[PDB]
Design a protein around this nucleic acid. Structure first.
Ligand SMILES: CC(=O)NC[C@H]1CN(c2ccc(N3CCOCC3)c(F)c2)C(=O)O1
Ligand SMILES: [Cl-]
Ligand SMILES: [Cl-]
Ligand SMILES: [Cl-]
Ligand SMILES: [Cl-]
Ligand SMILES: [Cl-]
Ligand SMILES: [K+]
Ligand SMILES: [Mg+2]
Ligand SMILES: [Mg+2]
Ligand SMILES: [Mg+2]
Ligand SMILES: [Mg+2]
Ligand SMILES: [Mg+2]
Ligand SMILES: [Mg+2]
Ligand SMILES: [Mg+2]
Ligand code: NA
Ligand code: NA
Ligand code: NA
Ligand code: NA
Ligand code: NA
Ligand code: NA
Ligand code: NA
Ligand code: NA
Ligand code: NA
Ligand SMILES: [Sr+2]
Ligand SMILES: [Sr+2]
Ligand SMILES: [Sr+2]
Ligand SMILES: [Sr+2]
Ligand SMILES: [Sr+2]
Ligand SMILES: [Sr+2]
Ligand SMILES: [Sr+2]
Ligand SMILES: [Sr+2]
Ligand SMILES: [Sr+2]
Ligand SMILES: [Sr+2]
Ligand SMILES: [Sr+2]
Ligand SMILES: [Sr+2]
Lengths: 29, 142, 172, 160
RNA sequence: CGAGUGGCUUGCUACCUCGAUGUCGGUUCCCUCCAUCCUGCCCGUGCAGAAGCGGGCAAGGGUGAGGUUGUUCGCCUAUUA
RNA sequence: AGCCUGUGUACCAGGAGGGGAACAACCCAGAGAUAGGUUAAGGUCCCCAAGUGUGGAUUAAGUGUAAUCCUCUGAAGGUGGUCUCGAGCCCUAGACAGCCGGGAGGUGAGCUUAGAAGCAGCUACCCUCUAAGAAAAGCGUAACAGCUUACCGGCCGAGGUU
């Protein structure tokens, strides 16, 4: 439940809106 | 040369001490025993400390004398004598009706006494009588 | 514990009793893998190392049996090679293969030739100031190389000044 | 003289100064070290060296251990480091030596020692969570200069 | 400062022996121990080399002749691995 | 001290027999003769009467197979030899390790100093780009270079670490 990983999955989804697991995470959103 | 053995034991891969204890018990019961393949009998432990003990016995001595055997032949038979009152009539009789051999001079194949077998697959720390004799300096006549 | 090693298509591994033999295009290697209650067997397309015990001492040998077998796989296909270099400061050292042993002459001026016998089917090919030890048995090759370097060992004098000798340059 | 000569409690308590004279002075320079103006409560960590066997420790040994311990604490935290260590025992027991055979053998006075029951704290330090390991090292050097084995026990301290 | 091993020194004890277990030193002759002085093989060096210094394995062999002194010990001399 | 000198008690002395290798006082035991039986201490692989007994675990040193003791040694200190139990933290949102790639600029910070550029000394230690990167944790240089720790990404795939 690392917070920085959670904040990253968000930041990533943010740039997707406008690590690889984290990218695949955001893509899953 | 020719030994009417009521029992022929196969020492191969068998714990010497355990075999000897039974062969003694039987010789005292009147059985004529012939231990076969002595060179292949085995004794557990760390080869290094085992050999130190047998080498020490070879070095002990004096004018009175402490003749200790080097061949697997005698090593084994002396092992048995230490389990017999060989200085008593009944004891010397038992002992003398027991003989150890290198290889197997008989036609039959000796039997394997219960509890005396060693599983090579589950054991690495053990040594062969033949190996000990070779270290002691014996002439590998087997 | 049980580990399964899928054998390379290039190779074929047979084993009877405590001896395992691996053959490939580069040759064959036979080893004895004997340890209390560790059974090694060839189950068709894979080699199996298993035991009912899981103590540290047993686990140690299992992992050891594994690398020994994989090394055999590698040895019979790609093979093993160590590269060595002969170096001298004043006296031209002469390294040569003669028979089944490598002979070194004129080491530090010595009149008597230093030599060492080669282990197994290890090939020691020398070219100029370069040597290449190779073969399928890593044990045999590894030693031969090492032996060659040990052959110029010096204890009497300061090694920092007298650095002549052959050294392993590349470990496989 | 070997400590084997006096490390055991095999004699009556002999401490009455009113009936004993010529008692040598103690070699223990200090019982309170570090910043002795500050309280022990002012520290997050409290570590004590505990003796594991009942014994007698001659003042010569207390000085050697204390010294070899505080010395380390000084070398690692400075001549004024923020720590404080205490040697809580004093050598009350008087020691003799019969230095003429076994005739009129009562020994002449030769020294002093402190009786320590197993489980007791000989020394106790108070430091900040930082220097917690420096004191453990100081004690390691300390129990090397006294007869019994010892447990280095961290009392007040859970930054572990 | 602390922990030990040995049983060569010395002390302590008084267990053995006072219807007797003859001294010290030496000599001669035999066996042994290792805590190794040399020799063999090693490691480190404030190891360039040479010669050293320190340490490890190791008891197979060797460890001698002389001046004072009854001396043991030790001091001294020339040889010596 | 198998020492000297007290005290209480049981023992030897003056106490057999059984056990303890042997052994005045340690264990069982206090004993008329003779006989049968059952135990005690102690023991049951052989010597030597009785188990090569059962369920389970540990030990690899022949440790050990030595109740007591002048008699049976083994200490302070040390041990990633091995087995067992507990606590905290990290981990399939990929941990620990390894290997591959990145380790960037303002800028060789300022100061001192001929010089100093992460790294002689002193002060400070800020912000950019970014998925990372110290005003530099350790080497290295005359000073640079060079070599790496921090820190990030990949490969891998299961426990790891205190
Ligand atoms: C002959 C004799 O008396 N035999 C009976 C005993 C005593 N003893 C003995 C005692 C003292 C001495 N000495 C030696 C030198 O210092 C003075 C006493 C001694 F030589 C010998 C010995 O061996 O056996
Ligand atoms: Cl003899
Ligand atoms: Cl007899
Ligand atoms: Cl084994
Ligand atoms: Cl009675
Ligand atoms: Cl033994
Ligand atoms: K006498
Ligand atoms: Mg007397
Ligand atoms: Mg030695
Ligand atoms: Mg030299
Ligand atoms: Mg000799
Ligand atoms: Mg009497
Ligand atoms: Mg019987
Ligand atoms: Mg023992
Ligand atoms: Na045995
Ligand atoms: Na003999
Ligand atoms: Na007197
Ligand atoms: Na001693
Ligand atoms: Na010798
Ligand atoms: Na002289
Ligand atoms: Na009585
Ligand atoms: Na008896
Ligand atoms: Na033993
Ligand atoms: Sr039987
Ligand atoms: Sr006392
Ligand atoms: Sr201690
Ligand atoms: Sr020795
Ligand atoms: Sr030498
Ligand atoms: Sr003398
Ligand atoms: Sr003198
Ligand atoms: Sr049994
Ligand atoms: Sr069992
Ligand atoms: Sr005795
Ligand atoms: Sr004891
Ligand atoms: Sr200890």
């Amino acid at each position: 439940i690392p917070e920085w990983k959670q904040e990253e999955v968000d930041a990533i989804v943010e740039m997707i809106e406008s690590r690889n697991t984290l990218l695949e995470r955001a893509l899953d959103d | 040369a020719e030994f009417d053995a009521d029992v022929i034991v196969d020492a191969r891969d068998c714990i010497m001490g355990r075999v000897a204890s039974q062969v003694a018990e039987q010789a005292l019961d009147g059985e004529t025993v012939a231990v076969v393949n002595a060179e292949r009998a085995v004794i557990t432990g760390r080869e290094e400390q085992i050999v130190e003990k047998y080498e020490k016995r070879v070095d002990i001595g004096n004018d009175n004398g402490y003749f200790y055997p080097k061949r697997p032949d005698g090593i084994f038979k002396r092992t048995i004598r230490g389990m017999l009152p060989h200085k008593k009539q009944r004891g010397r009789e038992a002992f003398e009706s027991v003989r150890v051999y290198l290889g197997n001079p008989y036609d039959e194949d000796g039997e394997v006494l219960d509890g005396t077998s060693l599983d090579r697959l589950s054991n690495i720390k053990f040594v062969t009588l033949g190996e000990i004799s070779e270290t002691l300096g014996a002439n590998k006549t087997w | 514990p049980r580990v399964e090693l899928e054998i390379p298509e290039d190779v074929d591994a047979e084993q009877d009793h405590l001896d395992i033999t691996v053959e490939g295009d580069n040759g064959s290697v036979t080893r004895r893998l004997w340890y209390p209650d560790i059974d090694v067997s060839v189950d068709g397309d894979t080699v199996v190392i298993e035991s009912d015990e899981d103590n540290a001492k047993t686990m140690s040998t299992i992992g050891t049996f594994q690398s020994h077998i994989e090394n055999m796989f590698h040895g019979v296909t790609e093979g093993w090679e160590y590269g060595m270099e002969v170096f001298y400061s004043h006296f031209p050292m002469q390294v040569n293969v003669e028979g089944d042993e490598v002979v070194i002459e004129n080491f530090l001026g010595e009149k008597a030739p230093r030599r060492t016998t080669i282990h197994g089917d290890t090939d020691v090919e020398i070219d100029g100031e370069e040597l290449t030890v190779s073969g399928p048995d890593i044990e045999a090759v590894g030693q031969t190389a090492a032996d060659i370097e040990q052959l110029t060992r010096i204890n009497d004098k300061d090694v920092r000044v007298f650095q002549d000798g052959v050294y392993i340059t590349r470990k496989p | 003289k070997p400590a084997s000569m006096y490390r055991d409690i095999d004699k009556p308590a002999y401490t009455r100064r009113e009936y004993i004279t010529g008692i040598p002075g103690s070699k223990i320079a200090q019982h309170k070290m570090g910043r002795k103006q500050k309280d022990a409560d002012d520290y997050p960590v409290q570590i004590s060296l505990i003796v594991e066997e009942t014994v007698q420790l001659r003042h010569g040994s207390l000085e050697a251990s204390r010294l070899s311990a505080n010395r380390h604490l000084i070398k690692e935290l400075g001549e004024e480091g923020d720590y404080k260590m205490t040697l809580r025992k004093f050598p009350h027991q008087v020691l003799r030596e019969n230095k003429d055979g076994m005739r009129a053998a009562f020994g002449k006075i030769v020294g002093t020692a402190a009786r320590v029951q197993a489980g007791e704290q000989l020394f106790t330090a108070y430091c900040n969570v930082e220097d917690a390991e420096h004191v453990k090292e100081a004690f390691r050097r300390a129990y090397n200069k006294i007869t019994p084995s010892c447990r280095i026990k961290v009392e007040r301290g859970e930054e572990l």
